[PDB]
Write a protein that binds this ligand. Structure first.
Ligand SMILES: Cc1cc2nc3c(=O)[nH]c(=O)nc-3n(C[C@H](O)[C@H](O)[C@H](O)COP(=O)(O)OP(=O)(O)OC[C@H]3O[C@@H](n4cnc5c(N)ncnc54)[C@H](O)[C@@H]3O)c2cc1C
Ligand SMILES: CCN1C(=O)CCC1=O
Length: 357
């Protein structure tokens, strides 16, 4: 039912969204190569005894997890204090220091050259990080909406977890031919045989779509004279304008039910998630983890704040988002759009699977 509608919406915007995310404005993401993990050392501390790999001795050295999850340094660019990602959307048409972008070794990564895919990352470390995230699902008891908050937090994490599982299944490395291709059996093992994980990805899709729909009317211009950035903002509006659905009438994140205390806690909770991404040993995994956790935190900030705000406050909320956050939000939407498409694609592979049996 709900899948049918969100799926139809996705069919319409899938290619335009993908095109938009490849643009110069959206293709880069600021990442601090410096990692500050509390649970352990992620700066120089390596992961031994395959504590960070999924269940490689018989495969070439260039297909080891450490390589599959490594960055492509050739596309990366230097990130200075003048980097627009640190600026408020209001400023587009110091800054990095003001908005707390205090990275010791920040760089701009080319997301087109560093896609989310199977990297072989996993084992005990990946398991510990996921468990820690699900376990930190705690809110002040007695607060109005405590159970709703715990349910929403869980669903967002689960949909995030599922989107990653879907991507590593869709873009899997065949160790025989050495080509990246869909792996149906893995998809079934990570997503297909667990219906609720698919539901949670649709939930996340609706949450992010709603945040984008809500801010669209208040997005400031990207530039006045620059034709390139001008057309970019136009293409963004064209995508968002097609997201309208009555599903948005639903209070997906219980914005109307959660107390102000729970909202801050909820927001603070996702901040901790973004932070534990620094413990992820796999570079590409950490990058996309940072992108998506930030995207979800941004969707939450938007939905919680725009809910009961007057028009003057709406333009303020949207205008103070940083380019960094907007990139995170749209790239996260792009991963969810791709995840739903992958589910559709796999359903067809499944069909032609049982037919060949
Ligand atoms: C932030 C982060 C980013 C990552 N990015 C990548 C990546 O880009 N590419 C790549 O190959 N690997 C990536 N990984 C690894 C990947 O998520 C898996 O942990 C991995 O493939 C090994 O899988 P597994 O079966 O051991 O456990 P997982 O499949 O992670 O399972 C963890 C446990 O959680 C449960 N679980 C699984 N999915 C869900 C869900 N959606 N909802 C509720 N429970 C679930 C399982 O039953 C199991 O108990 C990342 C890990 C983290 C922590
Ligand atoms: C009782 C311990 N606990 C919390 O405090 C939140 C999640 C959890 O299991």
């Amino acid at each position: 039912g709900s899948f049918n509608e969100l799926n139809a919406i996705n069919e319409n915007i899938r290619d335009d969204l993908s095109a938009l995310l490849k643009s110069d404005f959206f293709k880069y993401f600021r990442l601090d190569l410096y990692k500050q993990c509390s649970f352990w050392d992620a700066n120089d501390g390596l992961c031994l005894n395959r504590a960070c790999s999924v269940d490689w001795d018989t495969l070439p050295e260039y297909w080891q997890p450490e390589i599959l999850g490594s960055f492509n340094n050739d596309t990366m660019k230097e990130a200075d204090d003048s980097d627009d990602e640190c600026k408020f959307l209001d400023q587009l048409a110091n800054y990095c220091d003001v908005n707390d972008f205090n990275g010791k070794n920040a760089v701009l990564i080319d997301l087109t050259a560093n896609p989310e895919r199977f990297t072989g990352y996993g084992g005990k470390q990946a398991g510990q990080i996921w468990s820690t995230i699900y376990q930190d699902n705690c809110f002040t008891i007695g607060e109005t909406g405590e159970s709703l908050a715990k349910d929403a937090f869980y669903r967002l994490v689960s949909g995030f977890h599922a989107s990653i599982g879907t991507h590593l299944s869709k873009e899997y490395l065949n160790t025989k031919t050495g080509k990246w291709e869909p792996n149906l059996d893995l998809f079934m093992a990570r997503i297909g045989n667990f219906p609720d994980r698919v539901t949670n990805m649709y939930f996340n899709y609706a949450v992010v779509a709603k945040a984008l729909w809500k801010i669209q009317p208040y997005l400031p211009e990207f530039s006045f004279a620059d034709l390139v950035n001008k057309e970019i903002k136009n293409k963004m509006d064209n995508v968002i304008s097609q997201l309208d659905t009555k599903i948005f009438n639903e209070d997906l994140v219980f914005a109307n039910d959660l107390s102000l205390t729970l909202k801050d806690e909820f927001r603070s909770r996702f901040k901790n998630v973004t932070k534990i991404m620094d413990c992820v040993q796999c570079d590409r995994c950490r990058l996309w983890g940072k992108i998506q956790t930030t995207g979800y935190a941004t969707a939450l900030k938007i939905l919680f704040e725009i809910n009961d705000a007057d028009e003057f406050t709406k333009q303020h909320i949207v205008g103070k988002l940083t380019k960094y956050e907007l990139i995170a939000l749209l790239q996260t939407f792009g991963r969810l759009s791709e995840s739903i498409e992958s589910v559709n694609m796999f359903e067809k592979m499944y069909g032609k699977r049982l037919l060949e049996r």
